[PDB]
Design a protein around this ligand. Structure first.
Ligand SMILES: CC(=O)N[C@H]1[C@@H](OP(=O)(O)O)O[C@H](CO)[C@@H](O)[C@@H]1O
Ligand SMILES: N[C@@H](CC(=O)O)c1cccs1
Ligand SMILES: CCc1c(C)nn(C)c1N
Length: 467
């Protein structure tokens, strides 16, 4: 980079009051100077000031969603469920369904060196989360081809962060994309934002590098633009998109009932909830805020509304629609990302951020991280174009939040929930499990179907059913 270019960027950053980022320029080699220039050129210091000022010196009517925006697998006529299943499989057969996997962030509570998706929860098969999810996609394609006689393709768009992108790609490569076609799997990367000190200043990770952090799972939308994923969806004729979080080992990827329901109700956005397990559960709550669909994140709710009770049922929580990060979107919505993505607010968390001030190294929080949330598009959705669908936790939601030996939301509960699901399915089909649980490969059964061959047979738990 030329001296005139470098000087123009230094004036920009200095005039914006961020001139410290050049404080160690005189000590840098050419490579380190080149890095700093390119990194700093990717941010607008003035925009950073505006974000910092909103975050650091910042400036509601809550009810449960109305019954016209809600649904429940429990209250559902089994004929509707069967019809929605069939229409969902028809949409897969028409190559109209895509999956976006949010596999970014860090996964800091589990404390793994690898991307969370790689984690092996200890099933008999030792499949990772990624592989279980990939095989559900493959199975669903197989089921769809049974009705169409033609190839069925659910493209898998896998969003990672800067940190996790390279280990994610190597892993997929080493597993040959889990039997999927690499041309139908796109790994891409969310954006970053610089970390901001408590005094509003950009934090320097090193003498030549700014401390950045991923911009939240709400960064998914803009990243679909700049990565070309949205254009790939358009080329393929995608009309229905399922987005989910990688940490849930029970996730029904591209759930045909969910998608069939959303498409058939012609909603623009849909989302799955489970009954909140208690008042302190670390889950966003889905509700009606100032007349619109909305979510209150567990990190921003007050003890008041989290503890609020149903007027008629004094021991049930008034707000209990727990977000399980399972969203439906009509493709039409993604066509206007340019119009609304920059409207998504920036949520603030105080962080201890390793940085340099004459050498690297922070006891108490020295700055903040900014994040957009994926559910903050819900207030953009008309109530009659929104569906909040209750599902069964024990079939649909088993998150890996914590390291082993926590007690909940950890690898042991994940493994327990998967193998209880398998046993229950096998028992429904007439099999006898002896004994815990049974792992059922997604390639054998996506959601309980195709287990007739186990009828009358005895299975000694633990067991593993594959091809
Ligand atoms: C922005 C976002 O998606 N937050 C989600 C997500 O929380 P995490 O902080 O990422 O663990 O997972 C929860 C389900 O496990 C969900 O209830 C919550 O609202
Ligand atoms: N997703 C969480 C994780 C964190 O505390 O870093 C955030 C909330 C608000 C800003 S970041
Ligand atoms: C979620 C509803 C929607 C669609 C479709 N397009 N736009 C701009 C909105 N808000």
């Amino acid at each position: 980079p030329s001296a005139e270019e470098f000087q123009q960027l230094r004036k920009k950053y200095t005039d914006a009051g961020q001139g410290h980022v050049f404080a160690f320029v005189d000590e840098l080699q050419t490579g380190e100077r080149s890095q700093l220039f390119h990194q700093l050129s990717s941010f607008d210091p003035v925009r950073i000031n505006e974000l910092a000022d909103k975050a650091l010196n910042p400036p509601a009517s809550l009810e449960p969603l109305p019954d016209i925006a809600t649904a429940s697998i429990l209250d559902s006529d089994p004929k509707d469920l069967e019809q929605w299943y069939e229409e969902g499989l028809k949409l897969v057969a028409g190559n109209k369904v895509a999956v976006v996997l949010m596999a970014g962030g860090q996964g800091t509570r589990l404390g793994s060196s690898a991307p969370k998706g790689c984690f092996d929860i200890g099933l008999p098969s030792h499949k990772s989360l990624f592989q279980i999810q990939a095989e559900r996609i493959a199975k669903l394609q197989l089921l769809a081809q049974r009705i169409s006689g033609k190839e069925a393709v659910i493209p898998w768009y896998v969003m990672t962060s800067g940190p996790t992108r390279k280990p994610t790609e190597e892993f997929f490569e080493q597993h040959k994309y889990f039997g999927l076609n690499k041309s139908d799997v796109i790994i891409f990367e969310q954006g970053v934002l610089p970390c901001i000190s408590n005094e509003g200043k950009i934090l320097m990770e090193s003498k030549f590098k700014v401390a950045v952090a991923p911009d939240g799972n709400g960064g998914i939308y803009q990243a679909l633009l700049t990565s070309g994923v949205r254009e790939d969806m358009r080329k393929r004729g995608i009309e229905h998109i399922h987005t989910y979080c990688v940490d849930n080992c029970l996730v029904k990827v591209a759930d045909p009932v969910f998608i069939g329901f959303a498409a058939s109700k012609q909603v623009d956005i849909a989302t799955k909830v489970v009954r909140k397990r208690n008042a302190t559960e670390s889950v966003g709550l889905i509700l009606q805020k100032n007349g619109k669909p909305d979510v209150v994140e567990y990190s921003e709710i007050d003890k008041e509304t989290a503890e609020a009770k149903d007027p008629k049922q004094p021991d049930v929580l008034k707000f209990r629609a727990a977000n399980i990060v399972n969203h439906y979107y009509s493709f039409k919505f993604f066509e206007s990302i340019e119009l609304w993505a920059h409207k998504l607010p920036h949520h603030v968390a105080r962080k201890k951020i390793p940085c340099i001030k004459e050498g690297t190294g922070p006891e108490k929080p020295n700055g903040i991280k900014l994040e957009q949330f994926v559910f903050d598009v819900f207030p953009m959705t008309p109530l009659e174009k929104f569906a909040c669908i209750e599902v069964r936790r024990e079939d649909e939601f088993s998150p890996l939040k914590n390291a082993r030996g926590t007690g909940e939301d950890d690898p042991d509960t994940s493994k327990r929930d998967i193998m209880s699901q398998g046993q229950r399915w096998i028992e429904k089909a007439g099999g006898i499990v002896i004994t815990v649980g049974v792992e059922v490969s997604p390639l054998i059964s996506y959601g309980g179907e195709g287990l007739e061959f186990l009828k009358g047979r005895e299975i000694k738990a633990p067991a593993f059913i594959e091809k």
